[PDB]
Amino acid sequence: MDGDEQVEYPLKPIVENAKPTLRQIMAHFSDVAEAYIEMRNKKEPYMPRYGLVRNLRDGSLARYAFD
Amino acid sequence: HTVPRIKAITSKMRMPKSKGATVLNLEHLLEYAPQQIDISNTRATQSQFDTWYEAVQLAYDIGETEMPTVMNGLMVWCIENGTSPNINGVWVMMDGDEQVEYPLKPIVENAKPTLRQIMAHFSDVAEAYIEMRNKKEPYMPRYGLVRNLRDGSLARYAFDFYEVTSRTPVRAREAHIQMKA
Amino acid sequence: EHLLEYAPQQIDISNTRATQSQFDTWYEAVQLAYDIGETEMPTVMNGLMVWCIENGTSPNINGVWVMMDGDEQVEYPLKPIVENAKPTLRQIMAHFSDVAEAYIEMRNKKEPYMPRYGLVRNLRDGSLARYAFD
């Protein structure tokens, strides 16, 4: 995102050089993601789309609701 | 804070070149857009069709004001039969429940390269004639009739000298695969 | 040593494209046979690619190919073109294969354009037509 416009990047290099799996390597960011979600939830009701569409409804828990 | 955008690499096109000089003329190429109907290996060139049409006129010895009638029956005759008949023989037309015949030697001998590849000029019109006939009776050309085919509506695309372009329906386009198998 | 910097383009070392010498002989020999000035031959080859898109690349040795001047036909003998093409007309005219994509895309931007080869090859896809010549 650059000021209400979209820039795109190819996804082939990202999801192909991720051994063993993208989940098991991007989990390095899982610790920081809590800080980002908490910061966002301090200005608006923020809920990640994963736990959003997982029958879940709790708000405060949203800090722990990504894949 | 410029959020780097993946740089775009434009793979430069490779013009054919001889002795360090481009062969294609890029200018003329940008407006050289002829009809698909024109540049084909099926249809005969306008010169070859002109020679055939003129040579047939001299052999039959018929006035140019009346020849349109003669060629009017030539297309109809060639729909009902093939486009590679016997060199020696006749084709039949019609004046009120009687037959008039014309020798077939001049027609099938001055047709370069082949009678199919030169009579295909009539292939566009033949669709209009067949559709008109099918609007009053179940009409089927004898070629697709005896080619294991049974479809009725398709009959507009079931003669021997049919040429195929980009505007033929897929049902018509896939049909010629099976008949010409 | 040399192997660490010997990195030529893939376009160059192929068994499909003809060598620059063989393409040079064909382009020069056709010029002598047709007897056309080098300043005007670009026009002639401009229609040769378009003609070979609409048909195959293995036609009859004896015959003609058609070009166009304002709804009229001009023909050129096909014997010199298909006889001085070593090893084969397909393997030497493939120099034009890169440009042909640009021409087809330009045509398809104004009408539904499909080369007659892929047209009569059981194929039906439209956007793919940029990659459907012989």
Q: Which amino acid is at C134?
A: D
Residues of B within 8 A of A7 (CB-CB) are: 3, 5
**Could you give the C-alpha distances from C49 to C19, C89, C90, C92, C97, in angstroms and in order?**
18, 12, 11, 12, 9
Residues of B within 8 A of A2 (CB-CB) are: 3
Which DSSP string do the residues of B100-150 spell out, in sequence order? -EEESHHHHHS-SS-HHHHHGGGHHHHHHHHHHHHTTS----HHHHTTT--
For an interface test with A, the pick among B1, B2, B6, B9 (most A C-beta atoms closer than 10 Å) comes out as B6
Distance in Å, alpha carbon of B3 to nearest chain A alpha carbon = 7
DSSP lists the bridge partners of residue C77 as C64
Both tokens of B25, joined, read 């003329």
Query: Which residues does a chain break follow in chain C (C to N more than 2.5 Å)?
Result: none
Q: Confirm if B147 and B172 have CB atoms less than 8 A apart.
A: no
Report the C-alpha gap between C81 and B23 in whole angstroms: 15
For A9, the closest chain B residue by CA position comes to B6
| Helical spans, DSSP H, in chain C | 20-34, 41-54, 79-83, 89-93, 97-108, 116-119
Give B40's contacts (C-beta < 8 A, 6+ positions apart): B163, C54, C55, C116
In the block, residue with structure tokens 């000021």: A3
Which DSSP string do the residues of B11-73 spell out, in sequence order? ------BSSSSB-S-HHHHTT----TTTS-SSSPPHHHHHHHHHHHHHHHT--TTTHHHHHHH
Inter-chain touch C68–B16, beta carbons under 8 Å: no
Chain CA centroid to CA A54, Å: 15
Inter-chain touch C99–B30, beta carbons under 8 Å: no
Both tokens of B7, joined, read 């740089």
For B2, the closest chain A residue by CA position comes to A2
Inter-chain touch B38–C122, beta carbons under 8 Å: no
Which DSSP string do the residues of B71-94 spell out, in sequence order? HHHHHHHHHHS-SS--SS-EEE--
Report the C-alpha gap between C22 and C86 in whole angstroms: 6
Both tokens of B143, joined, read 């070629």
Residues of B within 8 A of C50 (CB-CB) are: 32, 34, 39
Inter-chain touch A2–B6, beta carbons under 8 Å: no
Radius of gyration for chain B, computed over Cα atoms and rounded to the nearest angstrom: 24
**Smallest Cα–Cα separation from B32: which of C133, C10, A7, C106?**
C106
Q: Do chains A and C touch (3 or more CB pairs under 8 A)?
A: no
Q: Do chains B and A touch (3 or more CB pairs under 8 A)?
A: yes
Give B175's contacts (C-beta < 8 A, 6+ positions apart): B149, B151, B154, B157, B158
Q: How was this structure determined?
A: cryo-EM
Q: Confirm if B160 and B146 have CB atoms less than 8 A apart.
A: no
- 8-state DSSP, C18: P
Q: Is the peptide bond before B85 cis (omega within 30 degrees of 0)?
A: no
- C41-54 and C20-34 helices cross at what angle (nearest 10)? 110
Data resolution in angstroms: 3.6
Give B109's contacts (C-beta < 8 A, 6+ positions apart): B87
Q: Confirm if C30 and C84 have CB atoms less than 8 A apart.
A: yes
Both tokens of C7, joined, read 């990195």
DSSP 3-state percent helix, strand, coil across chain A (nearest 5): 50, 0, 50
φ and ψ at A10, to 5 degrees?
Answer: -60, 145
In the block, residue with structure tokens 């014309």: B102
* Cα angle, residue B67 at apex, residues B66 and B70 outer, rounded to 5°: 110
Q: Pick from B23, B33, B47: which is nearest to C45 by CB?
A: B23
Q: Confirm if B49 and B71 have CB atoms less than 8 A apart.
A: no
Q: Pick from C45, C98, C107: which is nearest to B33 by CB?
A: C107
Distance in Å, alpha carbon of B84 to nearest chain C alpha carbon = 19
Both tokens of B115, joined, read 């009678």
Give C93's contacts (C-beta < 8 A, 6+ positions apart): C48, C49, C52, C57, C85
Distance in Å, alpha carbon of C130 to nearest chain B alpha carbon = 14
**Could you give the C-alpha distances from B149 to B129, B154, B159, B180, in angstroms and in order?**
20, 10, 12, 11
Distance in Å, alpha carbon of A7 to nearest chain B alpha carbon = 7
